[PDB]
């Protein structure tokens, strides 16, 4: 029951994580759902903000999360409290720093064998019951506000990382042997969407294909991500490898589309 959060630093990777956990913890008006202190058995921790300040993640953090899907509800919102009547899953945030990206990808590349268990309190290479760490979905989070910048380093280095990310899963598909293939649907999420410069999802989809595809050409001259023979690279080519690739927007902070669209994507995939 694991969904991997992936992306470069500043993407709001660690902060999106924070948003989903504190959702049920505060009512609309950002009230602490639990400031009636001194309820031993059940009282949820008080939270001061729906998302907290963060600095760059230096480690994967795996976090407890429950998706509600009251029937006809789709996945219900992440801000509804539950007490069970839910699919349960692990959202694992990951580091974005190029040095720390590598370990995560090793997980992506080996299919079933590794599975996806991180030895917490560190990286590799306290409540116990039959729990599992299955990998059914991966999320790639980018900054669609920073993507706008003419410096264009961001799209290039960002798309490059995505290239490997998508490439590894592609290698994972060719690792169905370890006879039990699983389809890994990928969400490309364009974050930082309350900002006015935030590049629209359709464009992020379009730019990425262009950047990714060129990288293959760039790398090919130097595997072929996507189609064996592509006039141009589309996300749709990735389907061949059982990879549902989706570009969806949202914002962790401020006014905008919200994170529910992402959240609705996640629940539909566990």
């Amino acid at each position: 029951p694991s969904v991997l959060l992936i992306g470069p630093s500043g993407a709001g990777k660690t902060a999106l994580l924070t948003l989903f956990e504190r959702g049920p913890l505060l009512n609309p008006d950002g009230t602490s759902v639990g400031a009636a202190d001194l309820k031993n058995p059940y009282r949820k921790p008080i939270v001061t903000s729906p998302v907290a300040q963060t600095h760059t993640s230096q480690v994967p953090t795996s976090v407890e999360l429950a998706v509600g899907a009251n029937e006809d509800g789709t996945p219900t919102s992440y801000k509804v409290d539950l007490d069970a009547t839910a699919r349960k899953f692990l959202l694992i945030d990951t580091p974005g720093h190029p040095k720390l990206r590598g370990t995560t990808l090793q997980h992506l590349l080996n299919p079933s064998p590794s599975l996806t268990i991180i030895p917490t309190n560190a990286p590799n290479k306290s409540h116990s019951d039959p729990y599992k760490s299955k990998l059914k979905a991966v999320i790639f989070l980018l900054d669609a506000a920073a993507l706008a910048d003419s410096d264009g380093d961001y799209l290039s280095q960002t798309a490059s990382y995505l290239y490997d990310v998508l490439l590894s899963l592609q290698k994972r598909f060719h690792s169905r042997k370890n006879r039990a293939p699983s389809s890994i649907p990928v969400l490309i999420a364009a974050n930082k969407q309350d900002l006015f410069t935030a590049v629209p999802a359709s464009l992020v989809k379009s730019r990425l294909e262009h950047e990714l595809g060129r990288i293959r050409k760039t790398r090919q001259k130097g595997g072929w991500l996507g189609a064996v023979g592509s006039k141009e690279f589309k996300f749709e080519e990735m389907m061949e490898f059982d990879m549902e690739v989706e570009v969806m927007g949202g914002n962790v902070i401020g006014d905008g589309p919200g994170a529910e669209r992402w959240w609705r994507w996640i629940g539909e995939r566990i």
Binding site: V47, H55, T120
Partner: protein, 135 residues
Amino acid sequence: MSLDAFEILTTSGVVLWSRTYAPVNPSVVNDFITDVFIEEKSAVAGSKNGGSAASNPPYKHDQHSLRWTFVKELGIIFVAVYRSLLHLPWVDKLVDNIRAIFVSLYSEQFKRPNTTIIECINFDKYFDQQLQELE
């Protein structure tokens, strides 16, 4: 007062507790953990010690890096923020012991594995008491 911002952030990035007196660029601390903990060119775990570095360009320019504490078991880091080589040694006295209070009060909570949520809300009261004793 008037020595900027104090932050208490986990190894994985979440900020358990923050006190900000001056607006501080996020990247300042962000640059800090990048070199101290991720690239690691000139740091050794300790209390009240060296607190110096310059990051190079894997991830940006960086200043030179406050004074700080690390709790490996809990994975929380304590940053008190200088003003570019302005100072008064109290933060040293402040920052290490101030982990000792924070650890004392909330050390139990890191044991829970599922969540990044440590509720330390009453802390600010203690913090003020401490700040005064160094004046």
